[PDB]
Design an enzyme around this catalytic site. Sequence first.
Site, short mmCIF file in Angstrom:
data_model
loop_
_atom_site.label_atom_id
_atom_site.label_comp_id
_atom_site.label_asym_id
_atom_site.label_seq_id
_atom_site.Cartn_x
_atom_site.Cartn_y
_atom_site.Cartn_z
N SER A 1 0.82 -1.24 0.00
CA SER A 1 0.00 0.00 0.00
C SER A 1 0.84 1.26 0.00
O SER A 1 1.82 1.34 0.76
CB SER A 1 -0.90 0.03 1.24
OG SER A 1 -1.76 -1.10 1.23
N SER B 1 2.45 -7.23 1.22
CA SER B 1 1.35 -6.59 1.96
C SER B 1 0.11 -6.62 1.08
O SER B 1 -0.28 -7.73 0.66
CB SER B 1 1.78 -5.20 2.44
OG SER B 1 0.86 -4.80 3.49
N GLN B 2 -0.53 -5.46 0.77
CA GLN B 2 -1.66 -5.55 -0.17
C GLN B 2 -1.27 -6.21 -1.48
O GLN B 2 -2.07 -6.90 -2.10
CB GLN B 2 -2.18 -4.12 -0.41
CG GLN B 2 -3.37 -4.15 -1.41
CD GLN B 2 -4.01 -2.81 -1.63
OE1 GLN B 2 -3.66 -1.78 -1.00
NE2 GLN B 2 -4.94 -2.85 -2.55
N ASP C 1 4.51 -10.04 12.84
CA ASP C 1 3.86 -9.27 11.76
C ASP C 1 2.39 -9.62 11.85
O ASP C 1 1.92 -10.67 11.36
CB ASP C 1 4.43 -9.61 10.38
CG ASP C 1 3.77 -8.76 9.29
OD1 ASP C 1 2.80 -8.02 9.60
OD2 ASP C 1 4.26 -8.81 8.14
N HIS D 1 6.57 -6.10 10.07
CA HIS D 1 6.05 -5.92 8.70
C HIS D 1 6.96 -5.07 7.83
O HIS D 1 6.87 -5.13 6.59
CB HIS D 1 4.69 -5.23 8.79
CG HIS D 1 3.96 -5.22 7.47
ND1 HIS D 1 3.46 -6.39 6.91
CD2 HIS D 1 3.69 -4.22 6.63
CE1 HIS D 1 2.90 -6.05 5.75
NE2 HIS D 1 3.02 -4.74 5.56
#
Length: 195
Positions: free
Chosen positions: A26, A104-105, A159, A172
């Site tokens: 993101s 992540s995303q 995470d 993360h």
Amino acid sequence: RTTRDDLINGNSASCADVIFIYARGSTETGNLGTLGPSIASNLESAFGKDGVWIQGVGGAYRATLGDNALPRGTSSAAIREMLGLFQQANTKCPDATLIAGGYSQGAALAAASIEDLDSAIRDKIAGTVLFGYTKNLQNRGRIPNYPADRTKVFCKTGDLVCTGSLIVAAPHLAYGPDARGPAPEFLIEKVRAVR
């Protein structure tokens, strides 16, 4: 840099043997973000600069924070974008081995796009690396419809996005070493085994 468009700017007469499609996290920069350039440099050291095409997922993937809360962890428009890039690689370079990744995303995006592919293109993706996989718990450490032995998830202890949360804690943010070493090493082993 943080933007690589080797597939979109390539053509069928200039095909590389290996095509890597990567989705950033993101609100990250370019189409490769913080981890993509590290993976790319390591792939290029192994295959040679002209042995691999590096392609980040740009276009309609805007990597907005809010879309993490959508059901598959990203938007349907982003999934269509990454599916179109896998199709472009298959159409332009039918003999190329594919590899994929996301953070992540972007990990949720890679998993959903691979789930949604047909088997003919999916089976060309020799390996996929996910970092900070926001659907790790939900998908039980897997990418739907894709074999575990082609999947390598980097989900650090602590995470919390790997345990069903959206909180971003320090683990993360610590995937840099994995992106410089064990993640591209896994992709290279899978590509060597197939080619």
